[PDB]
Design a protein around this ligand. Structure first.
Ligand SMILES: [Fe+2]
Ligand SMILES: [Fe+2]
Ligand SMILES: [Fe+2]
Ligand SMILES: [Fe+2]
Ligand SMILES: [Hg+2]
Ligand SMILES: [Hg+2]
Ligand SMILES: [Hg+2]
Ligand SMILES: [Hg+2]
Ligand SMILES: [Hg+2]
Ligand SMILES: [Hg+2]
Ligand SMILES: [Hg+2]
Ligand SMILES: [Hg+2]
Ligand SMILES: [Hg+2]
Ligand SMILES: [Hg+2]
Ligand SMILES: [Hg+2]
Ligand SMILES: [Hg+2]
Ligand SMILES: [Hg+2]
Lengths: 340, 340
């Protein structure tokens, strides 16, 4: 039931963000929600190329680092690489088949594209600091400490993609496939999409920012300055990506877009809350594996843990969820030098 | 069965271009086919912003055009808008789920992203030469002559996408879906993909160039200078895209990739030929509508048909197919200065 060009002439200003008629004409002279056009323009204005950044000194900096610090830096870089590997392809494969307005479709493609630039930047960094890049890349797929998160993230996407395929092929109803009953509910697919968006928002709002803290902690000591310059550019892109997911989520719950979605937003309010806490908890547990052999100037298990609660509280409130942690001011305001 | 991050550690240099293990880590330090990394780098170096191009005088020129010339200009633009609307989302939805090497996955996303920029440029042009863009955009969907010319494009993609979903959900074999027998053959899916690529190649190599000639015929008389600047940048991108498709097809035919694809290419030889001949005929049939209210000096049905036969022979030759048309010299050598 999916088509690359719906032959029905429809009003793209009246379609819901998702599940409406697939988009036909890509036009940008008008939009249901201006924010997505603004985000596309900003992202295009931010276009940068990794190769332009000098990372010639990061090699020696990395070599001079104590072993536990090399571990902290590389483990963090591997996680960033993993996140953008998934983000460069998933928004496209998972969201594109369900978007019903042109500005969001193009925003999703632009967003995914900017992530491939990030992936290209990580290769640029990695090849200029280790001699044998292959060791680093393989450890990304099999690192036990890392794969727990990837699995959980990939899962939401994989499940939504699967349910979408069934919906497009069979439509709503109770069907039979090779002797098994297969139930396809649009309401459940909508719930799937909502929770997946919330998960991507957490990936954007928390997972990445916790990794930025680690990267910039090195920059503060004037180490790995090539890497810092690249992460600063990536962080500027992520701020836009998070702005996009926050608007999608708030538009869906404010009842402005699809009434049934506003309904669902309220329905799984508790589940959404636990999803967020879980993510915060994962980044916390990670700080354990990170500083297993020691800490460093500006960063340690406790400070990092405090930043997680701080950032999580802000992000959750931004999407209308209750705060899970004790309120406090920023534990590491020095990071603002590198962020927004 | 599709996954956004396969957990199996595989040697990406040994996977086939399509139908192997979905890509997990996005790395660019090595590649099975260097040509795709070269294409990504080239496309990135060609990055341009449409709204930066000055089209303020285009409004004056257009209005000054006799009605039939306005018809020619706007009809051609509407077709280009359609092709890029489809090409901005199709490579991602149809190809991404089937790619198994990172360089190709990123090339497809980069290629699709460049098409969204093309769509953005058409809005920039349309919005600056007509009072109500909605009349132009709405006609793209309903116009029977535009849909007859483009007939078969979205159809191929939609069929591939549907067959792909069946494959990811059910796997190979014969199944029973709602009491009906559904056969899922990987070989048949490979055939579908192969012919889809050959169709995209014809779209990139012929359909777009026929439209460039019409656009540049105006630049030739010093009119629509803004549009001409844009079309030149767009043509520069399309040349990369067609290079990419020609390489994909020729690599598959060589047997150096999936040996089964080499067999399929050889077996589907006549179908490849038939679709190029069909695409050529569709472009010629378009002339009747393009010049219904009159033609222009140096631009008429006869010249368009001569050019179509000229470029078709060149394109079919590049992918190893026999030539359908009698050989001839370029009927419009003035285009060379505008292209590449
Ligand atoms: Fe990123
Ligand atoms: Fe991002
Ligand atoms: Fe294009
Ligand atoms: Fe193209
Ligand atoms: Hg998602
Ligand atoms: Hg998700
Ligand atoms: Hg970290
Ligand atoms: Hg951190
Ligand atoms: Hg929820
Ligand atoms: Hg919620
Ligand atoms: Hg804490
Ligand atoms: Hg295709
Ligand atoms: Hg196709
Ligand atoms: Hg034309
Ligand atoms: Hg033409
Ligand atoms: Hg062929
Ligand atoms: Hg001819």
């Amino acid at each position: 039931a999916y088509t690359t060009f719906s032959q029905t002439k429809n009003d793209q200003l009246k379609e819901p963000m998702f599940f409406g008629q697939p988009v036909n004409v890509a036009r940008y002279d008008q939009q249901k929600y201006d924010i997505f056009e603004k985000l596309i323009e900003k992202q295009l204005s931010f276009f940068w190329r990794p190769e332009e950044v000098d990372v010639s000194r990061d090699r020696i900096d990395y070599q001079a680092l104590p072993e536990h610090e090399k571990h902290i830096f590389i483990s963090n870089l591997k996680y960033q690489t993993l996140l953008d590997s998934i983000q460069g392809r998933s928004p496209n494969v998972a969201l594109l088949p369900l978007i019903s307005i042109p500005e969001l479709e193009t925003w999703v493609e632009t967003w995914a594209f900017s992530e491939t630039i990030h992936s290209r930047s990580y290769t640029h960094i990695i090849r200029n600091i280790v001699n044998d890049p292959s060791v680093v890349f393989d450890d990304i797929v099999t690192n036990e400490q890392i794969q727990k998160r990837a699995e959980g993230i990939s899962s939401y996407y994989d499940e939504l993609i699967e349910m979408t395929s069934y919906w497009h092929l069979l439509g709503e109803g109770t069907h039979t496939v090779n002797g098994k009953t297969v139930t396809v509910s649009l309401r459940e697919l909508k719930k799937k999409l909502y929770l997946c968006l919330m998960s991507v928002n957490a990936l954007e709002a928390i997972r990445f920012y916790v990794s930025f803290a680690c990267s910039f902690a090195f920059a503060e000591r004037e180490l790995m300055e090539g890497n810092a310059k690249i992460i600063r550019l990536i962080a500027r892109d992520e701020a836009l990506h998070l702005t996009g997911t926050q608007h999608m989520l708030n538009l869906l719950r404010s009842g402005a877009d699809d009434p049934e979605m506003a309904e669902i937003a309220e329905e799984c309010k508790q589940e959404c809350y636990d999803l967020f806490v879980q993510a915060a908890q994962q980044e916390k547990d990670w700080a354990d594996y990170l500083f297993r052999d020691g800490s460093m100037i500006g960063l340690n298990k406790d400070i990092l843990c405090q930043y997680v609660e701080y950032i999580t509280n802000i992000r959750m409130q931004a999407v209308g969820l209750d705060l899970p942690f004790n309120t406090r001011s920023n534990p590491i305001p020095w990071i603002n030098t590198w962020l927004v």
